């Protein structure tokens, strides 16, 4: 694999700049590192190729590079369509033939946020005999795609298969995300509670709930 | 040069699969697979004309790519499969026109691998309680298979607020979507929330009420 | 017969302009390719030095003492076989016989300068490979004639 | 003096190695055959035909009776000026001189012959370009040496 950030973003009126650091024998010896867009379910377009080359098709925006041995897309003059993963590929000429990068989340902050809120959802008397309690932490209408749902309940940390789901189109153009973690079901009244905090850079939200008022 | 891929394959975790790739000189028909969530990760590179298919160090033992000159086609073989093995796959050529590199271009449109113990499953509804001034209520689906399935409020009036949530990725491949919507929660005997949640390749309709936690 | 004599083929000075043609050539990644490398390759193959005007079949050439400059042959790679090295200023100019129908080597965007390689076996038998991207010319046979134009020995 | 003579550079027949010598050359952009295409080129140029052994400067070519087979070069108008084409068989095989710091021309992965392109004024004014990619070789001045083989006409 390549050495390829994803936390990219900027206004849309600047200039960025993505990372691709691979070998120091093939990138700055052999020149072949290729580029992609990958739109939300879609599959994958050619917009760079051999370093410094677009297609008939690929607007002028993109620009290709090779700083020694970190190879970089520069997107000038940013669109609005342009919120897609962004990839660089040199075919190494060694024991591994083709060499793809991490993937560069692109997310053209230009939409205001709202106020994050969050709370757990305890299950009611249909779903205590169902054996079925689950808590969503249903957090809508926020940016920049990066959310990853934690659960350290008054200093806790416990994850081997959580079950965890990411954001898509919903009616109103927001981003939502959720997080169902695992509960112990023998063990409630023993055991203390379940907390639910993300980062996102502003939002500050604590849930602590009790089993026994 | 114009790239076809085959449909959907769904399969059980240890067995065998072709896919076709047909096209419409000197190209050079790849494959790299794309596991959900992670990034795209090379495995063949067939050379049609030619006939031989050097793979990547990582595979080879379960992917065979072999190459009809016939009609132009290329299949790719994913014996021994898994749940891990569950991801899109694309055929992909190189071309620009009149030149030939180290790059892909253009892509099939995606066999759906779809690999896990299931053929016809349906779920019934689950709601999520409005335990309680705002409440962002709504109803939360467990396991089925095939996706999607459809979930809306009320059947006419409250269906502004649909969302799917895409493939949860884990150690099985049964799917699981939510669907929420935001409605004032002043209303739970006169205006009975029941939710629907359906599912169409296993027949039958259920519809649940939403009522909080007791 | 004595025709006039001029300076023999085997003896090479940097800088003379070699042409090879390659009749019934082929596409190989696996003879001077240990994982996935590409070169055109001949079994009966003539070799020219377009400055004298002397010429000769690579398998009727004693490669033994194929020198450069008063120093025989280098022998940098080994892939497959053995292989004796004909260094070249710039790229190799090759292509399809008669047909404008160019090829490109492997390194065909670099500063990379392209070397000549051929396989002896000691008497009476000889290969010449030239670097290659894919099959831009087809799968052989393939008749090619290439150009270059030799460098200084390392 | 009148020393042995030979067959003249002015006339080309298509297979003869063409030896360019573009010393001092400049990279340039939208300057030649089409718009937005990169290309070498120099004031003074040094054209030699390998085959025959004959010489000239480029300046120094009445360019009106260049012929290749006794046919006039096929001289194309660029979106600027009017330009003399001399045709070859497979790619330009140019290089920084001296070192192996080897060229590659715009059309480096496909199978289009490159050909070389000459500017003339009518009288002791001539300019030769040489396909390329982008500055592998630098800015300028930047001396440079190319082979080729030409090719038959259109």
């Known amino acids: ?59 002028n925006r993109f620009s290709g590079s090779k700083s020694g041995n970190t190879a970089s897309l520069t997107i000038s003059g940013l669109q609005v369509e342009d919120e897609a993963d962004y990839y660089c590929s040199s075919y190494t000429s060694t024991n591994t033939p083709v060499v793809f990068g991490g993937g560069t989340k692109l997310t053209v902050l230009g939409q205001p946020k709202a106020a994050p809120s969050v709370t757990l959802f305890p299950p009611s008397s249909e779903e205590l005999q169902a054996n079925k309690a689950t808590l969503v932490c249903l957090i809508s209408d926020f940016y920049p795609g990066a959310v990853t749902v934690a659960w350290k309940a ?36 023993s055991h203390r509670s379940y907390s639910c905090q993300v980062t996102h850079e502003g939002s500050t939200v604590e849930k602590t709930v009790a089993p026994t008022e | 040069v114009q790239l076809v891929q085959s449909g959907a394959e769904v399969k059980k975790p240890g067995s065998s699969v072709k896919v076709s790739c047909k096209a419409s000189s000197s190209y050079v028909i790849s494959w790299v697979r794309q596991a959900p969530g992670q990034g795209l990760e090379w495995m063949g590179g067939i050379i049609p004309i030619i006939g031989t298919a050097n793979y990547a160090p990582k595979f080879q033992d ?26 899109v ?60 399935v459809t979930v809306s409020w009320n059947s006419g009036a409250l269906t502004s607020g649909v969302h799917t949530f895409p493939a949860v990725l884990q150690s099985s491949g049964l799917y699981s979507l939510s669907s929420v919507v935001t409605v004032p929660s002043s ?28 | ?43 009966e193959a003539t070799i020219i030095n377009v400055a004298t005007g002397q ?76 670097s290659t991207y894919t099959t831009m010319l087809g799968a052989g046979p393939v008749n090619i004639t290439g150009l270059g134009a030799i460098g200084p020995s390392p």
């Open chain 2, 62 to 87: 379960t992917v065979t790519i072999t190459a009809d000159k016939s009609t132009n086609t290329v299949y790719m073989e994913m014996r021994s499969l898994r749940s891990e093995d569950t991801a």
């Open chain 2, 187 to 214: 209303s739970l005997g006169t205006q009975t929330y029941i939710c629907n949640v359906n599912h169409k390749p296993s027949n039958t309709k259920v519809d649940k009420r939403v009522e909080p936690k007791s």
């Open chain 1, 1 to 59: 694999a390549l050495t390829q950030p994803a936390s990219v973003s900027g206004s849309p009126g600047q200039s960025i700049t993505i990372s691709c650091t691979g070998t120091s024998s093939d990138i700055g010896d052999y020149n072949f590192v290729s580029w992609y867009q990958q739109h939300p379910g879609k599959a994958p377009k050619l917009m760079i190729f051999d370093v410094t080359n677009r297609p008939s098709g690929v607007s």
């Open chain 2, 89 to 148: 796959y694309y055929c992909a050529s190189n071309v620009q026109l009149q030149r030939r590199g180290n790059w892909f271009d253009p892509w099939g449109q995606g066999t759906l691998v779809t690999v896990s113990s299931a053929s016809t499953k349906g779920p019934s509804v689950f709601p999520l309680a409005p335990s309680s001034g705002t409440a962002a209520l709504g109803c939360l689906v467990k396991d089925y298979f095939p996706e999607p």
């Open chain 3, 55 to 130: 010429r000769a079949l690579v398998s009727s050439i004693k490669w033994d003492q194929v020198t450069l400059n008063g120093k025989v042959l280098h022998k940098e790679t080994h892939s497959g076989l053995v292989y004796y090295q004909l260094p070249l200023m710039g790229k190799i100019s090759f292509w399809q016989q008669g047909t404008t129908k160019a090829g490109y080597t492997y390194n065909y965007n670099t500063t990379d300068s392209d070397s000549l390689w051929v396989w002896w076996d000691g008497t009476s038998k000889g290969y010449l490979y030239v």
């Open chain 3, 1 to 43: 017969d004595k025709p006039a004599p001029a300076r023999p083929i085997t003896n090479w000075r940097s800088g003379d302009v070699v042409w090879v043609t390659l009749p019934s050539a082929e596409y190989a990644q696996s003879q001077s390719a240990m994982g996935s490398h590409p070169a055109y390759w001949s079994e």
């Open chain 1, 154 to 189: 008054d200093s806790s940390p416990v994850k081997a298969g959580v079950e965890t789901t990411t954001p898509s189109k919903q009616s109103n153009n927001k981003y939502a995300a959720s997080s169902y973690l695992s509960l112990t079901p023998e063990q409630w009244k």
